[PDB]
Subunit: 219 residues, 4 copies
Amino acid sequence: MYLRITNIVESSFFTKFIIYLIVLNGITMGLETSKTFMQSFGVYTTLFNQIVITIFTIEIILRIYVHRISFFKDPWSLFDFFVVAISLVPTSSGFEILRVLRVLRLFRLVTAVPQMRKIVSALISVIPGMLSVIALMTLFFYIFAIMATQLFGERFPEWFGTLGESFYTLFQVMTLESWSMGIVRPLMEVYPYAWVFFIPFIFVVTFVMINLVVAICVD
Amino acid sequence: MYLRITNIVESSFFTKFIIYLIVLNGITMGLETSKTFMQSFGVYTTLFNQIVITIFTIEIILRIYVHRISFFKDPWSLFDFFVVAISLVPTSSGFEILRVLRVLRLFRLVTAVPQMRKIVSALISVIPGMLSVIALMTLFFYIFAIMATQLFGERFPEWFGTLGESFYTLFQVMTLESWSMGIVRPLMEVYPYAWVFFIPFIFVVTFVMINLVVAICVD
Amino acid sequence: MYLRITNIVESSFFTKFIIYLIVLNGITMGLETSKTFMQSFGVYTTLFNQIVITIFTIEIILRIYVHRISFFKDPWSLFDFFVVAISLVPTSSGFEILRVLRVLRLFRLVTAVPQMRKIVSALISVIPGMLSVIALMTLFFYIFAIMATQLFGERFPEWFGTLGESFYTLFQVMTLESWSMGIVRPLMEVYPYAWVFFIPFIFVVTFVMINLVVAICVD
Amino acid sequence: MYLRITNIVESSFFTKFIIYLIVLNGITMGLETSKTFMQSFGVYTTLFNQIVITIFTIEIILRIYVHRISFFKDPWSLFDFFVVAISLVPTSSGFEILRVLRVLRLFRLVTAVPQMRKIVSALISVIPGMLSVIALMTLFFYIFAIMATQLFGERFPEWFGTLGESFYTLFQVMTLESWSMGIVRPLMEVYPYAWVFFIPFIFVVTFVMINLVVAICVD
Ligand SMILES: [Ca+2]
Ligand SMILES: [Ca+2]
């Protein structure tokens, strides 16, 4: 029966049947957004949902026999497994993000369809070359996030009161969003020199960020 | 009579005469902005407008005899047809955007002058090589737009209440405009971890965007 | 006496002397900012200012005899002429910007110190290859600016009431600064569909600017 | 005894020992953020802190005997000396930013681990090649900062009242953060033409920045 199913799994029909379901389950998840729609045809799509969930575990079960060990070494497959596992956790108990994390199965459209995998792979591949920089920034953020918590956190605890808060605020300054009117002109009503902290921070952080892009335009 | 008019239409005078009307109609449209101007010379320029509107259909009528099927397979010609057709719809009924969409005819200065044609063509040509990324993103947006509506839409209906509202708001985050103080800090007053949704959303979307630019700096 | 002064002008001493005054007059202009300073050494500097202005007309007079027609064909030289000229208009009458436009003479440090000429020249040279695009956009701005004035100017005359007001606002959206919370969300309270005008606008305008940058990174 | 210690300092175990203390002291500083932690184990940490500071002085002393002049001509060594020195100034007196500047010792993780050095060095190296542009800009800022102070400082002293105040405000505009709704629309309620100062300012500074990025994207 092995080759019987190895022929079912590898079939164009099977793979296109899966893809057909993703675009259907995606269309159905956009409709579950409408509180109106849910009042009318709610039970339909709650069932239609659970149906697809079964179908998908059946496939992943079928797909595992055909591949065994090879499957739990395939990034795209590992994903598909974990993205379905989330969708099996009872619609209750634990955390309720789990109900919401269910929309992640629509990322199977990236998995099930090539060109997409290509494009995703193309993107992902750029990451190892960046880890040296990324390592650098996180060190850098960490260092300033500490200075900031202990330099500004007493008077301005919303923004800098906690290590985590500083991270967030520094990040915000890094995206350069409302950094002056929002954070530093305020800080300067109390700490006139706060500009001496944040302008150098902005330069260094924006510089590094430019360099990193130039690097991705050389690989 | 064909070759007679084929020599009228294909003439330098013809082409340059059309260009003369565009730069003239365009000037007349900047003046129709002023309520002052309209109180004095409004009659002049409404009629001048209708005149130019005739002339342009006449030309398009002429241009179609000279080209027949060659024309409805010309992108630039198709445009001029549609844009003039808009300008034909009676200054009444339906939607006032049809009155406003009339200004689209000034895009004929792009259509009727090469170099422009080249430049526009240069730009457009870059697009097909972005469609893999663009497709990828819209899936990504759609997934997160869905996540957002069910995570934040009950307490925050202005911003995430409807799928469409999530889209707009997610877009707003992508352009990084007032993303934190405008959206995520508020959100965090009620949902402390919302940074876990938006910091990742930001990284991915800005990453993809950098890559997309790097792609264009190859081709 | 001609070659005598051609030996005065072309001298190393002459140029470095001009340069030395620039750095001095520049330092002196940052000091004229201080209302404190002016209350003490103010006359010292007002006269110092009037002195250097003479020295500069003398130079421009000298440089003209030594170069005659070749001079009024030199960008850098024309500049110092027009810049020094501005600084000759009495400290009175007409407009009061002219007194303020005086500090433009510090741009002579660019004109008079090589390598600066290089860098400026390096920079300026790029503009020709952007002219086709820059043209394209101004047509584009102009068309949308007209559309906006007649679509939003009645309810929102601060932002869109006038052709020029619209220019400014569209410019502001293009730098993507406070475009949503500041302009488009407000607009949507009256015109639900304004997002149909501003999202495509942003895309086009951002796209074009990416292409223009990619273009520069080839030439 | 020299070669005895030269073999200690140059030992892999030594360096790895140093790197160990850095990652350890860095963990300690993250914990010194918690007002909680300090009440519990504050003493443990302030002592562990002074211990590490000792060890590092011992090291730098050792390191200097083994390198002498070679050391004080080494960027990375000079750094480590100057960073450890800051941490030596007693917990008392002068400026208390000195207590805060202590956390700068976590930059030793950049100094002591290569690849980081590589990456930092890669970054730093681009700077000499940017100095022509950087000099040009600062003169530019200086010229406009002076103009701005005398054009807007009377009615708007928060933003332009002082040379330094103008620098900051112009800097804020350059990062394009809230430049319109926050600054120029205000300015225009009093000075209708201020757009004539800031739009040209914005173009130039943004132009220069695109060139500087492209310049790097070759070198
Ligand atoms: Ca912003
Ligand atoms: Ca803002």
